[PDB]
Amino acid sequence: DGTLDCISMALTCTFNRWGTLLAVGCNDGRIVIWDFLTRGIAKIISAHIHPVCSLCWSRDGHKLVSASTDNIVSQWDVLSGDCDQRFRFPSPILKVQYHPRDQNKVLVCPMKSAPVMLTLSDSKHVVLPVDDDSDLNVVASFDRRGEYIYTGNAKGKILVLKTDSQDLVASFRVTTGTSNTTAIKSIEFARKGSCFLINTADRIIRVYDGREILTCGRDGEPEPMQKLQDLVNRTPWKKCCFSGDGEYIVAGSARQHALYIWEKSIGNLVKILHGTRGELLLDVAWHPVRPIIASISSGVVSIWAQNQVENWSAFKELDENVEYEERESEFDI
Amino acid sequence: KPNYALKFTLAGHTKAVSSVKFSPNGEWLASSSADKLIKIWGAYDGKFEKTISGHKLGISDVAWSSDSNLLVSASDDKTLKIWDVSSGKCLKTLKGHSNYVFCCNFNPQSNLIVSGSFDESVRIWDVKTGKCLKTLPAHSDPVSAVHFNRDGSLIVSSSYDGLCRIWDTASGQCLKTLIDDDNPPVSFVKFSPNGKYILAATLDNTLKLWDYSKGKCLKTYTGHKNEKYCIFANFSVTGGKWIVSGSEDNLVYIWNLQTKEIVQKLQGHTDVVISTACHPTENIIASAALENDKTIKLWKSDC
Amino acid sequence: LPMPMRFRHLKKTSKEAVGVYRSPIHGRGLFCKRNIDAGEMVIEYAGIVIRSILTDKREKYYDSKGIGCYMFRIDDSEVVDATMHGNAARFINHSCEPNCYSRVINIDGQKHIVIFAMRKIYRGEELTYDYKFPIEDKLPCNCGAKKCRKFLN
Ligand SMILES: Nc1ncnc2c1ncn2[C@@H]1O[C@H](CSCC[C@H](N)C(=O)O)[C@@H](O)[C@H]1O
Ligand SMILES: Nc1ncnc2c1ncn2[C@@H]1O[C@H](CSCC[C@H](N)C(=O)O)[C@@H](O)[C@H]1O
Ligand SMILES: [Zn+2]
Ligand SMILES: [Zn+2]
Numbered sequence A: 001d002g003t004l005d006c007i008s009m010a011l012t013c014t015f016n017r018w019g020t021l022l023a024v025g026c027n028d029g030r031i032v033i034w035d036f037l038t039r040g041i042a043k044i045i046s047a048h049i050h051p052v053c054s055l056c057w058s059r060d061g062h063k064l065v066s067a068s069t070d071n072i073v074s075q076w077d078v079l080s081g082d083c084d085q086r087f088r089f090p091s092p093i094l095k096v097q098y099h100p101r102d103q104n105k106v107l108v109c110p111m112k113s114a115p116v117m118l119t120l121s122d123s124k125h126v127v128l129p130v131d132d133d134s135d136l137n138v139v140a141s142f143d144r145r146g147e148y149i150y151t152g153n154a155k156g157k158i159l160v161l162k163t164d165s166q167d168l169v170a171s172f173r174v175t176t177g178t179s180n181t182t183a184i185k186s187i188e189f190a191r192k193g194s195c196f197l198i199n200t201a202d203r204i205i206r207v208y209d210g211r212e213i214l215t216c217g218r219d220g221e222p223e224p225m226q227k228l229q230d231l232v233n234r235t236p237w238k239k240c241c242f243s244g245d246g247e248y249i250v251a252g253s254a255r256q257h258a259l260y261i262w263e264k265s266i267g268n269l270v271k272i273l274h275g276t277r278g279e280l281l282l283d284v285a286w287h288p289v290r291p292i293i294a295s296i297s298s299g300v301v302s303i304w305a306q307n308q309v310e311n312w313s314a315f316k317e318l319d320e321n322v323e324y325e326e327r328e329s330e331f332d333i
Numbered sequence B: 001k002p003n004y005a006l007k008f009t010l011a012g013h014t015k016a017v018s019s020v021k022f023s024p025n026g027e028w029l030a031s032s033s034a035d036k037l038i039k040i041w042g043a044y045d046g047k048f049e050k051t052i053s054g055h056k057l058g059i060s061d062v063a064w065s066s067d068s069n070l071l072v073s074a075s076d077d078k079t080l081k082i083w084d085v086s087s088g089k090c091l092k093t094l095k096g097h098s099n100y101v102f103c104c105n106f107n108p109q110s111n112l113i114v115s116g117s118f119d120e121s122v123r124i125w126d127v128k129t130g131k132c133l134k135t136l137p138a139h140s141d142p143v144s145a146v147h148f149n150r151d152g153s154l155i156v157s158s159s160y161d162g163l164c165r166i167w168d169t170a171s172g173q174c175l176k177t178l179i180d181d182d183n184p185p186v187s188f189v190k191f192s193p194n195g196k197y198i199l200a201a202t203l204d205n206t207l208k209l210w211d212y213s214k215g216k217c218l219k220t221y222t223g224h225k226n227e228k229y230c231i232f233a234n235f236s237v238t239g240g241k242w243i244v245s246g247s248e249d250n251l252v253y254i255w256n257l258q259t260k261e262i263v264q265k266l267q268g269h270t271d272v273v274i275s276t277a278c279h280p281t282e283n284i285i286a287s288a289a290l291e292n293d294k295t296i297k298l299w300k301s302d303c
Numbered sequence C: 001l002p003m004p005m006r007f008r009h010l011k012k013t014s015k016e017a018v019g020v021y022r023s024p025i026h027g028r029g030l031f032c033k034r035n036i037d038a039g040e041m042v043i044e045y046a047g048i049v050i051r052s053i054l055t056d057k058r059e060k061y062y063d064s065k066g067i068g069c070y071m072f073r074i075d076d077s078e079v080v081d082a083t084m085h086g087n088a089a090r091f092i093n094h095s096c097e098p099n100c101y102s103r104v105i106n107i108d109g110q111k112h113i114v115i116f117a118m119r120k121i122y123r124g125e126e127l128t129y130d131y132k133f134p135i136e137d138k139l140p141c142n143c144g145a146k147k148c149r150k151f152l153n
Helices: A210-216 C003-017 C052-065
Strands: A012-015 A021-025 A030-035 A040-046 A052-057 A063-068 A072-077 A083-088 A093-099 A102-110 A116-119 A125-127 A138-142 A148-153 A157-162 A168-173 A184-189 A195-200 A205-209 A226-228 A239-242 A248-253 A258-263 A269-274 A281-286 A293-297 A300-304 B005-011 B017-022 B028-033 B037-042 B048-053 B059-064 B070-075 B080-084 B090-094 B101-106 B112-117 B122-126 B132-136 B143-148 B154-159 B164-168 B174-178 B186-191 B197-202 B206-211 B217-221 B233-236 B242-246 B252-256 B262-266 B273-278 B284-289 B295-300 C018-022 C028-032 C041-044 C047-051 C071-073 C078-086 C100-107 C110-117
Touching: A012 A052, A012 A281, A012 A293, A021 A052, A030 A052, A052 A093, A063 A093, A063 A102, A093 A138, A102 A138, A138 A184, A148 A184, A148 A210, A157 A210, A168 A210, A184 A239, A195 A239, A205 A210, A205 A248, A239 A281, A248 A281, B005 B284, B017 B284, B028 B059, B037 B059, B070 B101, B070 B112, B080 B112, B112 B143, B112 B154, B122 B154, B154 B186, B164 B197, B197 B233, B206 B242, B233 B273, B242 B273, B242 B284, C003 C041, C003 C100, C003 C110, C047 C052, C052 C071, C052 C078
Parallel strands: B017 B059, B017 B273, B059 B101, B101 B143, B143 B186
Antiparallel strands: A012 A021, A021 A030, A030 A040, A052 A063, A063 A072, A072 A083, A093 A102, A102 A116, A116 A125, A138 A148, A148 A157, A157 A168, A184 A195, A195 A205, A205 A226, A239 A248, A248 A258, A258 A269, A281 A293, A293 A300, B005 B295, B017 B028, B028 B037, B037 B048, B059 B070, B070 B080, B080 B090, B101 B112, B112 B122, B122 B132, B143 B154, B154 B164, B164 B174, B186 B197, B197 B206, B206 B217, B233 B242, B242 B252, B252 B262, B273 B284, B284 B295, C018 C028, C041 C110, C047 C078, C071 C078, C100 C110
16 A cells, blocks of 8 residues: 555664654664655664664654664664664563653563663663563553553563552453463553553453553453454464554554454454565554554565545535425425 | 835846745745746845846746745746755756646745646655655646645645645645635635635635635635736735735735725835735835836835 | 345445546546446446426526536436536446446335446446437547447437
8 A cells, every 4th residue: 555665674663753754673773764744764874783673752753762683772863863872781672662751761671581661861770570570571561651561471460560669550460261371462552542452472452441450450350441353364463553543453464464453442343454465564553643554564664544535526525316305485486 | 004115126037027935034035037037135125145047947936945945946947946045056956747837835844845837737746855746636727826734734726727725735635625606716825824714816806815624715805906917915914914915006905904904005016016925024025016117125114 | 136235335335446537538537446347336326316397497507607417317207416416427428339337226215327337347447338318410429439429419
């Protein structure tokens, strides 16, 4: 539905705060900041020699946190492209995430170690707690306002901490239905409201409302707002995301390189988008204020927009025949 | 009511002037004409800054950049040309319009260009590569004026076929089509400063301010004379809220914005006052007349 | 399949089945965007359903407004007038060799004029049917068909 030839080795992308720019990582380890309106590249940053697998914009949009595969995280000013700060860790980093309401702070999910929240002003770090002490794979994310931290382990356990004190404000373990746990693949939140989603190893996305987890307390049984899956193919989900408003949810079937689109309230599947059967789906993102969806597959990015009835359909356009309502004086002088 | 008095008279274009525009900083005045020449002048003293040539045919429109650093020139050579105002260098020459290009405008973020041509199709252009990104069979007649909204989400277009069409920028979607019960040839169109209204001139001695959210004409302005040429209209805001325009009677008409009543008539031009420009900061109005005058006059009022 | 079910399917798929583009026949016209099988519903000429006696009063009205008449005779009693309110079917050119044909259907008591496909129409093809305009005294035709009557009338 529209691709870009000007970028190669697309690996990970991230919309800015207003959905005007897109920073995509490349295998060479370069940042390609490409613009939507001019439909061209806005910037090229020599980030790492190692490909970049995690990228996040700052709220003001002037900072981008990038993670190399060399366990090298670095902050870059979008105007200049300089490495503002640079750090390295053990247990290679799985993800970075700016704090949405404090760009000085940034959480980092490493591979084998617990996620740690650092600051840029001071090169300090706060290691977030781990429930089972043996997960070795815990994804973590700020909420919409950056007030709480949601951490999900490979054993389905879900901890909600407060971002400042790291104190356990809520907890619950998700189930595979019967009695078993499932590897929490990812935690996503809505940029609007409080609904969030969890991708798990059961290939079943679970949509909740964080207020219900907060009122559920520690070690409770919160039910999901929704349960979403491909009941037909039972396909895993490499990457999923909400819509900009938060009423549409998309999942990327890397198994068959497709895109499933459900709703939030009803949860019925909006639609499906099919990509090149030969392409391996890698990354998925939604335009924050547009029905536009960016996909990264086999190093190539594709764009999926959604237009209205007009752009040619605007006499007064009607859809179905209209019986004329004759009047009393319809034949009168 | 304004008391605009003539302060500086500017001239030098060997042919009919087609557009004069104040720089957004109010530092310069760019004047385009059919003589394939553009003229930058001092905006406060009438000091002729320089002449920028390079276009192959007559110039029908020119538009400033928001940072007062670039100028797009739409010429009758079917080409646009983006110039650095400081060096006068032809940074870009935009090819692709199949006929005479009549109007041109930058996006509010100055990184994009809209262009109307005689080909009756509106082209949407990159700035940093100068590449045409979109092209729309907008009207059934040569386009007269195109302009951006306050942010660059909407593009308004006018043409001789009398249609005023609002189009989506991201998609080219023809959002709205404003009709006034007839087919009056619309020679100019532009958004309101608040992006809430639209000023459109029709070639029947009539100006019309429409509500965008309502899609209906809110105010009308007459008393001037405009029936053949692309006479520009501007919002006087640095002092009182007025509507300033040229007229085919050698006058510079100034109506009250709200009451729609003529608040001043600047006389001194000998030909049709073909182009108008309002200073962004000061109560200064540049009025350029046609070839029987070939003069640009600065007017300064106290309110 | 039921004419109501077929009609619902047609009204669901019409917006994405056909388009309007610049036409070598004349100006702008209806082109096929997805291969259309023979006899299947191509498009409704949707519009204002009126009685026949009110046609002239409308026509003269448009004659007073300089607006072209977009009317198709449903039958001796009804007409779909699409001049002021219609759909994309107002951009179907005519060809002496049509791959389409107009038929009136009755859904729940109301008549609908649906252009169906005379043959298997493929993507990109411009959609044309037989207007069957009576012989006047002359509109030249540029349909391009070898059997072209040189005139609709
Ligand atoms: N096959 C044909 N031969 C000659 N004229 C044709 C034609 N098909 C259509 N036309 C002309 O095209 C007109 C269609 S009304 C549509 C007007 C114009 N094509 C537009 O898109 O805006 C008719 O009035 C008729 O005069
Ligand atoms: N063979 C033909 N010769 C002349 N006009 C034709 C024609 N076939 C279709 N038309 C045009 O079709 C119109 C009636 S229905 C309009 C459909 C037309 N394709 C359009 O784009 O508007 C008439 O006004 C006439 O101009
Ligand atoms: Zn024919
Ligand atoms: Zn024929």
